[PDB]
Write a protein that binds this ligand. Structure first.
Ligand SMILES: Cn1cnc(Cn2c(=O)nc(Nc3cc4cn(C)nc4cc3Cl)n(Cc3cc(F)c(F)cc3F)c2=O)n1
Ligand SMILES: Cn1cnc(Cn2c(=O)nc(Nc3cc4cn(C)nc4cc3Cl)n(Cc3cc(F)c(F)cc3F)c2=O)n1
Ligand SMILES: [Cl-]
Ligand SMILES: [Cl-]
Ligand SMILES: [Mg+2]
Ligand SMILES: [Mg+2]
Lengths: 301, 300
């Protein structure tokens, strides 16, 4: 019963967060085995941040320039390297709290949990989605650089996001743990705009299934539509197209509710064209698109 | 960007255990050498409708309780019942015990919930104690015993232990002293909650949030009395404002330079005139599950 924006328990990641400092620049890092991962922007001074020459800047550094702090303890850096936009610091002590983990690059529309950290201290946890324009609508303040996003599958932590910067519109940009940015952004202190965003249609449908499971059904109708006819209306409203794979992945929700996917699409089409008429769905006046079909199945089963 | 942000759950994850009595199983909270859980665990299927807890507990011994941290058994060496919580003394002090206290939260306040099943944490989310002393949580069967909490630097304030779901789908529970929030009892019967109302103090915090972010079209040059506003609020199914609410709005009042009673008069006009097709923070609805501290917490 109920439906909330639910994040994974963050304990396994909290045990990995540390503080990285270089000169006066400081941000958060991720301590896994005997390696600390953090954004390379940490090696910039104010004069460097606007237009960094990262390769030269890293050559001009030594292990003794990096200050790594796990709580009130200092970790000794014995080696450093750069992988795209992520700095890799080898330390002489392996993190005893390292969980089973892997690095994954998520696709637009997928969700993950974000552990917001400041000066190496976890501050809050929330659930986000990778937007179609490769930004995330996070909640970050100054000092959040290096916070990570993740999913947990059984006992394995999948790290998928490392936070880097805020954009002028208030959305956020970052990389995977290989250091490759999501979207067309660069780790420079310049004003960078994102492309026009779209709505994650498959997630809206899963959320509508969530609404039905919780007894909210006013938006249902007795009509169905074709995948193509629905996609034509979706694109007109800046909604992402629905693929047959999406229809398949919604199968468990359709089977649970007895409402065919294309039946639910006809309800979404009417919502797009007529709006909610002052109504709400799961307490929302807007169509939520940051719940994947798996999140719904997970939270309602 | 404004998100419903929960506290990091690690400090609480290290305290979640499973408690089983016969085949009845739920979650417990392991702090120092004591485990706290709902007393409903001593019920068999046929006792859940109308249990005699005194009688059911008299026929229990330490060796009838199975406490497990993961697959590791913690032997129960003593037990006690306080209100609707059971306190089980175990032979192991939890080495992961954080700094903690027990607190009873007030209506309208928020907290993080660590949803657990069979002693295994499953998810974390933020929610508010509604004015009718229910919470609009997200719980499935087996979530009994999950806890709600707030963290103050290094101190964990435990404020909620989940017990049951009501016919309307909302949830009811106790503080960690075992005292229910609201007029509910731990029986498997249909219990209706009082009529819910909107958390006025949180709507006000949200309006201050909008002003901080540059959304100010709804301000007016009028003020009102606290009493006059509270009388009008009840007419619109809004909760009356308490002196604590006026107090906690102070920092937002000072940050924007807009007096509390001044912002109340702006809200009063919104209630009477509506938004006229306008939006506040990109929303057509007024959010009431963000407290003044949540705003201070997320907006510097
Ligand atoms: C308001 N907000 C929302 N998200 C963020 C994240 N963020 C951040 O936390 N820090 C940044 N710059 C730094 C300044 C520093 C000053 N000192 C002493 N140490 C500092 C360390 C950092 Cl990282 N930035 C800006 C930024 C960070 C990058 F990694 C990047 F590639 C480009 C950028 F413009 C930032 O966005 N703040
Ligand atoms: C769908 N949903 C939403 N929230 C809840 C919470 N919840 C729960 O998890 N369990 C409950 N009853 C039990 C049944 C058991 C069967 N076995 C084998 N072991 C069991 C243990 C419990 Cl606790 N209930 C019902 C319930 C639990 C109480 F603590 C109470 F005082 C009255 C009640 F009606 C429940 O609501 N399920
Ligand atoms: Cl640029
Ligand atoms: Cl007054
Ligand atoms: Mg239909
Ligand atoms: Mg006014």
């Amino acid at each position: 019963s109920g439906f909330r924006k639910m994040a994974f328990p963050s304990g396994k990641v909290e045990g990995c967060m540390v503080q990285v400092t270089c000169g006066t620049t400081t941000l958060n890092g991720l301590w896994l085995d005997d390696v600390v991962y953090c954004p390379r922007h940490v090696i910039c001074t104010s004069e460097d941040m606007f237009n960094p020459n990262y390769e030269d800047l890293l050559i001009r550094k030594s292990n003794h320039n990096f200050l790594v702090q796990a709580g009130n303890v200092q970790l000794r850096v014995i080696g450093h390297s750069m992988q795209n936009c992520v700095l890799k610091l080898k330390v002489d002590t392996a993190n005893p709290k390292t969980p089973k983990y892997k690095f994954v690059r998520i696709q637009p529309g997928q969700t993950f949990s974000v552990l917001a950290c400041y000066n190496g201290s976890p501050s809050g946890v929330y659930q986000c989605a990778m937007r179609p324009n490769f930004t995330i609508k996070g909640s970050f303040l100054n000092g959040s650089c290096g916070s990570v996003g993740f999913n947990i599958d059984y006992d394995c932590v999948s790290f998928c996001y490392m936070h880097h910067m805020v954009l002028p519109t208030g959305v956020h940009a970052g990389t995977d743990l290989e250091g490759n940015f999501y979207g067309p952004f660069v780790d420079r202190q310049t004003a960078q705009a994102a492309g026009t965003d779209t709505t994650i249609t498959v997630n809206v449908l899963a959320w509508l299934y969530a609404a039905v499971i919780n007894g909210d059904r006013w938006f249902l109708n007795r009509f169905t539509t074709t995948l193509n006819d629905f996609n034509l209306v979706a694109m007109k409203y800046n909604y992402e197209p629905l693929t047959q794979d999406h229809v398949d992945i919604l199968g468990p929700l359709s089977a649970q509710t007895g409402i065919a996917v294309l039946d639910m699409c006809a309800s979404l089409k009417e919502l797009l064209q007529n709006g909610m008429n002052g109504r709400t769905i799961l307490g929302s006046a807007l169509l939520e698109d940051e719940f994947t079909p798996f999140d719904v199945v997970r939270q309602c089963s």
